[PDB]
Amino acid sequence: DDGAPPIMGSSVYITVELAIAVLAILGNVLVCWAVWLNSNLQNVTNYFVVSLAAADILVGVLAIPFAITISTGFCAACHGCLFIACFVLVLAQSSIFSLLAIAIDRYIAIAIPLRYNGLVTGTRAAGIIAICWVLSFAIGLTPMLGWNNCGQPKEGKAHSQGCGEGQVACLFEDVVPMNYMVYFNFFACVLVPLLLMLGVYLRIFAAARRQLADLEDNWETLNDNLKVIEKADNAAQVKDALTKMRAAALDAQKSPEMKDFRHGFDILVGQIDDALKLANEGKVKEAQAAAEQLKTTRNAYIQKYLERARSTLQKEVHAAKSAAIIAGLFALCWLPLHIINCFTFFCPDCSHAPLWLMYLAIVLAHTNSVVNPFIYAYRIREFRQTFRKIIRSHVL
Ligand SMILES: CC(C)CCC[C@@H](C)[C@H]1CC[C@H]2[C@@H]3CC=C4C[C@@H](O)CC[C@]4(C)[C@H]3CC[C@]12C
Ligand SMILES: CC(C)CCC[C@@H](C)[C@H]1CC[C@H]2[C@@H]3CC=C4C[C@@H](O)CC[C@]4(C)[C@H]3CC[C@]12C
Ligand SMILES: CC(C)CCC[C@@H](C)[C@H]1CC[C@H]2[C@@H]3CC=C4C[C@@H](O)CC[C@]4(C)[C@H]3CC[C@]12C
Ligand SMILES: CCCCC#Cc1nc(N)c2nc(-c3cccs3)n([C@@H]3OC[C@@H](O)[C@H]3O)c2n1
Ligand SMILES: CCCCCCCC/C=C\CCCCCCCC(=O)OC[C@H](O)CO
Ligand SMILES: CCCCCCCC/C=C\CCCCCCCC(=O)OC[C@H](O)CO
Ligand SMILES: CCCCCCCC/C=C\CCCCCCCC(=O)OC[C@H](O)CO
Ligand SMILES: CCCCCCCC/C=C\CCCCCCCC(=O)OC[C@H](O)CO
Ligand SMILES: CCCCCCCC/C=C\CCCCCCCC(=O)O
Ligand SMILES: CCCCCCCC/C=C\CCCCCCCC(=O)O
Ligand SMILES: CCCCCCCC/C=C\CCCCCCCC(=O)O
Ligand SMILES: CCCCCCCC/C=C\CCCCCCCC(=O)O
Ligand code: NA
C-alpha cells in the first residue's frame, strides 16, 4: 500500500460519472420533449434522433450506474456481472444503427428527392427502429450466449475478495473476452459501420456539389445562348441556340410558389417555341425580338427558381454536416477506449493502460451522451427555438 486509498480515486470517477448521467438525461429528455411537442420537428430523420436520444437517456439511467458498479469489483454471479458489463454495448450499437439510418436518410433525400416521401415514411421508420433495437440487444449481449470468460474464472482474485461459490470479482476485462471486444465489437460492429457512414456522407456532399454546379450551368447556358441569339447573323444561328435552350428548359422542368414556377416554365417554353417558329420561317429579326422577351420571364421567374433551388440544396448540405458532426463526435468519444482495448489485446508485452487512463477513457465515452442536444441547439434553428419555449415555459 504505497498508492492512495482506492476510494479516493473512485470518488472522483464516480462523481464525474454521476454528473455526466444527470446531464445526459436532462439534455436528451429535452430532445424527446421537443420532437413530441413541435410538429415541424416530426419527420423520419428526427425519429432516429429520438431513438438516439433514448439510447443516451439509458446511458445515464442504466449504463453509468452499471459502470460505477463494475468499478468496485464486487462479488457477483459471473453471468450477472456479464450482463451489466455488456449492456452499454447494446446502447452503443443502437446509436450506430441510428447514426447509419440518419446518413442513409439524408442520402435518399438528396439523391432521389422526388420519390423520398413515398419511399421513406414514418411507419417504415418506426419498424426499422424496432428491428435495430432487437439487433442491438443480440449484438451487444452476444457474450451472454457463450462467448465469455465465465468458464475460466480468476479464482485467486475471487478468493482474495471473499466471493462465494459461482461468483467472481466483477470486472469488465475479466468476463468480457478481448477478442470479442476488438474483432467483433470494434472492427465488425463499430469501425465498419462508421466507415460506411463516411462513404455515405462523401456521396451526399459529392451529390450536392454536382447538383449545385449543374444548376449554375443551366443558368449560364440560358444567358449564353441569349447572347448568341442577340449577336446572330442569320436565322439558322438563332434556331441552333433556341433548340439548345428548349431542351434545357424542359430539362429544368423536372404550393403557391410552386404554382408560379410551373407558370414560369410554361411561359419560357412557349416563348422559345414562338421564337423557334419565327426562326424556321427565316424571320431573323422577328425571332430575335421574340427571344428578348425571355429576359422578362428570366427576371420574374427563372432567377427566383434558381435561388430557391440553391437555397434548398444549401440547407441540405447544412443538415448533412450537422448529422456528420454527430457521427464524428461518436467516433471521437469512443475511439480512445477502443484503441486502449487494441493495445491490451495486440501488445501483450505492453503494460496495461493505467487505471486513471481507463477512468478518463470511460468518462469520455459516456460524455458522448451529453453532446448531441448541444449540436441540435447550435445548428438547427427549429430545435433551438423549441428548446427555448420549453425552458422559458416550464423550467423558468
Ligand atoms: C428495466 C430496469 C428498470 C430494470 C433494471 C434491472 C437491473 C438493475 C437488474 C436486472 C438483472 C440484475 C442482475 C442480475 C444478476 C446479478 C448477479 C448477482 O450476483 C449480483 C447482481 C446482478 C449483477 C444483478 C444486478 C441488477 C440487475 C442488472
Ligand atoms: C484522436 C483520438 C481518438 C486518438 C486517441 C489515441 C489514444 C487513445 C492513444 C494515443 C497514445 C496511446 C498510448 C500510447 C502508449 C501506451 C503505453 C502502453 O504500455 C499502454 C497503452 C498506451 C497507454 C496507449 C493507450 C492509447 C493512447 C493513449
Ligand atoms: C481510422 C481509424 C480511426 C481507425 C483506428 C485504427 C486503429 C485500429 C489503430 C490505430 C493505432 C493502432 C495501434 C498502434 C500500435 C499498436 C502496438 C502494436 O504492438 C500492436 C498493434 C497496435 C495496438 C495498433 C492496433 C491498431 C490501432 C489501434
Ligand atoms: C478500470 C475502470 C473501471 C472498471 C472498468 C472497465 C472497462 N474496461 C474496458 N476495457 C472497457 N471497454 C469498454 C467498452 C465498451 C464498448 C466499447 S469499449 N468498457 C465500457 O465502455 C464504457 C463503460 O460503459 C465501460 O463499462 C470498458 N470498461
Ligand atoms: C466533448 C468531448 C468531452 C469533453 C469533456 C472532457 C472529457 C472528460 C470529461 C470530464 C473531465 C475528466 C474528469 C476526469 C475523471 C477521471 C479521472 C479520475 O477518475 O481520476 C482518477 C484518480 O485521479 C486516480 O485514480
Ligand atoms: C436523478 C436524481 C439523482 C439520483 C442519483 C444521486 C443519488 C446517488 C448518490 C450517490 C451514489 C454513490 C454511489 C455509491 C458507490 C460507492 C462505491 C465505492 O465508494 O466503493 C468503491 C470501491 O469500494 C473501491 O473501489
Ligand atoms: C419503464 C420500465 C419498463 C422497462 C421494461 C422492462 C421489461 C423487462 C423485461 C424482461 C427483463 C428480463 C431480465 C433480463 C435481465 C436479467 C439477465 C439475467 O437473467 O442474467 C442474470 C443471471 O440470472 C445471472 O445468474
Ligand atoms: C425493443 C426492445 C428490444 C428488446 C428485445 C430483446 C432481444 C434480446 C435478443 C437477444 C439477447 C439474448 C441474450 C441471451 C440472454 C441470456 C440471459 C441469461 O439468462 O443467461 C444467464 C444465465 O441464465 C446464467 O447462466
Ligand atoms: C417487453 C417488450 C415490449 C416493449 C414495448 C416496446 C417498448 C416501448 C418503448 C418506448 C415507447 C415510446 C415509443 C415512441 C412513442 C412515439 C409516439 C407516436 O408514435 O406517436
Ligand atoms: C428508473 C430505472 C432505475 C434502474 C435502476 C438501476 C440502478 C442500479 C444499478 C446497478 C445495480 C447495482 C447492483 C450491485 C449488486 C451488489 C450486491 C452484492 O453486494 O453482492
Ligand atoms: C434514475 C437513476 C437510476 C438509479 C441509479 C441510482 C444511483 C446509484 C449509482 C450507482 C450504484 C452503485 C451501487 C454499488 C454497487 C455494489 C458495490 C458493492 O457491492 O460493494
Ligand atoms: C463532466 C461533464 C462533461 C460535460 C461535457 C461537455 C458537454 C458539452 C456539449 C457539447 C459541446 C459541443 C457544443 C458545440 C457544438 C456546436 C455545433 C456547431 O456549430 O458546429
Ligand atoms: Na449514444
UniProtKB/Swiss-Prot annotation:
Residues that coordinate or bind adenosine: 173, 341, 365-366
Membrane topology: Multi-pass membrane protein
Location of the protein in the cell: Cell membrane
Disulfide-bond pairs as recorded: 75-163, 78-150, 81-170, 347-350
Carbohydrate-modified residues: 158
GO CC, any one term: postsynaptic membrane
Free-text description of this protein's post-translational modifications in UniProt: Ubiquitinated. Deubiquitinated by USP4; leading to stabilization and expression at the cell surface.
An annotated GO BP: cell-cell signaling
Oligomeric form and interacting partners: Interacts (via cytoplasmic C-terminal domain) with USP4; the interaction is direct. May interact with DRD4. Interacts with NECAB2. Interacts (via cytoplasmic C-terminal domain) with GAS2L2; interaction enhances receptor-mediated adenylyl cyclase activity.
Function recorded in the entry: Receptor for adenosine. The activity of this receptor is mediated by G proteins which activate adenylyl cyclase.
Protein name per the record: Adenosine receptor A2a
